[PDB]
Amino acid sequence: LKANVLQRLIGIISDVNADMALLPDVLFLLGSLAVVPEIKTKIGELNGIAACTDLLQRALPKPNTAPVVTNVCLAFANICIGHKKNTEIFSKLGGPALNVKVLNDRGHEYDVCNAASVLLCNLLYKNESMKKLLGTNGAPAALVKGLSNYDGSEEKTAIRCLESVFKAISNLSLYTPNIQPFLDAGIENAYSTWLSNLSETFPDAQLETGCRTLVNLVMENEENNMRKFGVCLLPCMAVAKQGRTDTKALLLLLDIEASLCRLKENAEAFAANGGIETTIRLIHQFDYDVGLLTLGIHLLGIQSAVKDSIQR
């Protein structure tokens, strides 16, 4: 305080002609000092969040700003997390919408997408205020857009990105209010594209994180919703032929199917696409797995009702 460190960082952030190589590090340090709850509030008070929102605004359309945009987003995440007073200064500055803008306008950039998604989650934490706002802010859509924009790349950047987009989606869905938005946004069509573009090379850990949400999306037996996510059957099934050994991944993949196959339209599709054949091929390899057995026979139990299936 006596050396006016915060004001100095804050000033460099404000200097329209700041050194573009140093500024990432400036942003990172500011956010880091928020670790001491005193300085966190005092950044808010010393008009830091404003200097940061201004910088995000004048940096979004510029090129060669990826380091700057990610770090400002993260700084926001470390400054606002469970800090109502600082969260409110952010909201009154229109920061939620900025976040969504960052996802919508710069989802192609892996480091950026990642940081923006972290910000979202860091706001939702504790602040219900934040929960509702983002569901309406158009955030749900942006996330979905990103999922549907995944290129199936397998670089750490990309991977970490997804794991963060998915994390956001989940922490949003946590609030029942913000579920429906996602459905209007067409999450179903995105998940489908994701699975349909996946590879056997694709990391199993991610598959989990992903499917884990789908699982919840389709958990209840709302007939219409099963119809809604019907697009997710044939790709869920193609991805289970691939030949993985992650039991915890396959459990989800089949749980998706089991939920879905509570609809005769999908049960039949399952059957017609050699679902039952591949289900027993799977059950065999993994018959040590108490759960994947429990779910594979349950998934066959539906098929006694289906026609021309007992024969199959």
Q: What is the 3-state secondary structure (H, E, C) of 190-233?
A: HHHHHHHHCCCCCCHHHHHHHHHHHHHHCCCCCHHHHHHHHHHH
| CA–CA distance, 12 with 9 (Å, rounded to integer) | 5
| CA–CA distance, 308 with 211 (Å, rounded to integer) | 30
| Cα dist from 7 to 80, 118, 251, 275, whole Å | 18, 26, 53, 63
| CA–CA distance, 182 with 275 (Å, rounded to integer) | 28
| Cα dist from 183 to 190, 196, 238, 254, whole Å | 11, 19, 23, 22
Instruction: Check residue 306 and report its DSSP letter.
Output: S
Residue 62's SS3 state is coil
CB-CB contact of 310 with 302 (8 Å): no
**Cα torsion 263, 207, 205, 241: sign:** positive
The tokens describing 78, both together, are 């470390």
CB-CB contact of 257 with 302 (8 Å): no
**Cα torsion 231, 148, 224, 172: sign:** positive
| CA–CA distance, 163 with 170 (Å, rounded to integer) | 11
Experimental method: X-ray
Residue 125's SS3 state is coil
Read off φ and ψ for residue 199, nearest 5 degrees: -125, 165
Instruction: Check residue 64 and report its DSSP letter.
Output: S
| CA–CA distance, 162 with 148 (Å, rounded to integer) | 11
Select from 242, 312, 222 the least CA-distant residue to 274: 312
Those residues with Cβ within 8 angstroms of residue 176's Cβ, 6 or more apart along the chain or in another chain: none
Those residues with Cβ within 8 angstroms of residue 237's Cβ, 6 or more apart along the chain or in another chain: 257, 270, 273, 275, 278
Give the residue carrying structure tokens 């089991």: 258
Question: Residue 184's CB: how many other CB atoms inside 10 A?
Answer: 10
Determine if residue 82 is left, alpha or beta; phi over 0 gives left, psi from -120 to 50 gives alpha, anything else beta.
left
Instruction: Check residue 128 and report its DSSP letter.
Output: H
| CA–CA distance, 3 with 7 (Å, rounded to integer) | 9
Select from 155, 38, 21 the least CA-distant residue to 5: 38
| CA–CA distance, 21 with 28 (Å, rounded to integer) | 12
Q: What is the DSSP string of 149-175?
A: T-----SHHHHHHHHHHHHHHHHHHTS
CB-CB contact of 48 with 94 (8 Å): no
Select from 20, 30, 168 the least CA-distant residue to 100: 168
The tokens describing 234, both together, are 């044939």
Q: What is the DSSP string of 129-155?
A: HHHHHHHHHTHHHHHHHHHTT-----S
Number of helices (H) and strands (E), helices first, in the chain?
A: 20, 0
